[PDB]
Amino acid sequence: QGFSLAQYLQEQKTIVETALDQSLVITEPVTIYEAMRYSLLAGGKRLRPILCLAACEMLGGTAAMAMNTACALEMIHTMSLIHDDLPAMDNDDLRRGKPTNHKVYGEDIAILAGDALLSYAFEYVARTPDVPAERLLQVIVRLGQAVGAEGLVGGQVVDLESETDVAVETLNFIHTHKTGALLEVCVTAGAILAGAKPEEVQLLSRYAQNIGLAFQIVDDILSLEKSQAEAQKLVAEAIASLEPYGEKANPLKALAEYI
């Protein structure tokens, strides 16, 4: 028996997208929900929710334990894009060929749509049905650290301050460490939801950190080249050593080999 990532991604992406859709039921001021759904339901790879389910499932958890957190992660990812596209930031006029949130609804609504998604992410983790509350709190804490000044937002800030040819290699590492912070918390949250012991959470953390780095190397070899691609390989190789789980680890090993 051999493992097809394309099938897995297809199966998972389907279940994730119905969950995303169900999470935002349209009421009161319909424009806010519309603006949220517009960015959240515009398709994509959905790697972040999938990493979460992967990690949870590998450790013995179920889709039902991780699904809310998985949607939460995608909501956070979405709102970072909504905010990043704003004129005051990257000033993007379209994304995946479709116009960006603010171009459809206005900068004001876009800002609020992002805010709504960010807070809803936490609300949603906390409404997770069948999981001890202690685990959910840990996810919420880690999610907080990943998204804020010590993570995603932190990275975006350093990124903006460097947006300079003389930029150091360590300034490149802090910038890309924060997109890894989102990525790390995907597998970390999954593990915690499953009831993983701290050593496992660290195992996954380091796996996530390594993958995160590798992604930005190859995206740079489109930050680079013959030795750049060597590093990306050493790192994905170290990661793909979570052999202790054997067959259960196929999705994560597969997913890693995005080179």
Author numbering: 9 to 171, 174 to 232, 258 to 259, 263 to 297
What is written in the article reporting this PDB entry?
We obtained CrtE crystals in two different crystallization conditions. In both cases CrtE crystals had the same space group - P212121. Each CrtE monomer is composed of 14 α-helices (A to L, and α1) joined by connecting loops. In addition, residues in helices E, F1 and F2 at the homodimer interface are non-polar. Notably, the side chain of Phe-130 in helix E is involved in a π-π interaction with its counterpart in the other subunit, which also has been found in A. thaliana GFPPS and Sulfolobus solfataricus HexPPS. As shown in the electrostatic surface potential map, there are a number of positively charged amino acid residues (Lys-53, Arg-54, and Arg-56) located at the bottom of the catalytic cavity, which are proposed to bind the IPP substrate. Binding sites for Mg2+ and DMAPP could not be obtained in this study, but have been reported in previous structural studies of GGPPS from S. cerevisiae, Plasmodium falciparum, and Corynebacterium glutamicum.
In this study, we report the first crystal structure of GGPPS (CrtE) from a cyanobacterium – in our case the model strain Synechococcus sp.
